[PDB]
Amino acid sequence: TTDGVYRVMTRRLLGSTQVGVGVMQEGVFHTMWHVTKGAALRSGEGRLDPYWGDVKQDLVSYCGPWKLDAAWDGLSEVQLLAVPPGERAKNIQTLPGIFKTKDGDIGAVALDYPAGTSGSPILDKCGRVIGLYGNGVVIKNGSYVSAITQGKRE
Amino acid sequence: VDMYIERAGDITWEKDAEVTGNSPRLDVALDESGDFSLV
């Protein structure tokens, strides 16, 4: 339960497969709904049970309520702490674009990683998590663009 | 319980970091299944 970034693994497919990534903060594990589909997780000999989740937001928390509440300021570069399958964690700095929706505008990160990188955290210059990478679109020119997906701290 | 977690690092801003990616402005829609589509 040390704070930090974690891989989410399964043995249900061939060998051991990385299906996504998440963030341990304040004793809560944070990831994208489509990574776990709300299943329980193991950490060593211990179990993490889902506590909150929402398919439309594509988010889920384990062991307690969603704790991440920092926001992209709309101006500054950010860092993706990318954790790709079988590869070391690496920081990638970028200026977000924008997703424009009927319900308002969201920052967007235009970086292409494999599906199992979903749930990698996006950071501000204070190292705060401003959202998770891995729900987005493929655009005309073929690139992957991710929303900056952030939950609500209740 | 199939799925398990393994630590991969600390959450820190790195001054060394490689700078890349563009900043597209995109009209999108979000459906009830949490799927984005381009408008």
Ligand SMILES: Cc1cc([C@H](Nc2ccc3c(c2)CNC3)C(=O)NCC(F)F)cc(C(F)(F)F)c1
């Ligand atoms: C990093 C990454 C993430 C995705 C991601 N997949 C996905 C799958 C199921 C659901 C959702 C997201 C949200 N609701 C259920 C995604 O945005 N998909 C949309 C588009 F990009 F395909 C996909 C990829 C990859 F591009 F590699 F397929 C990568």
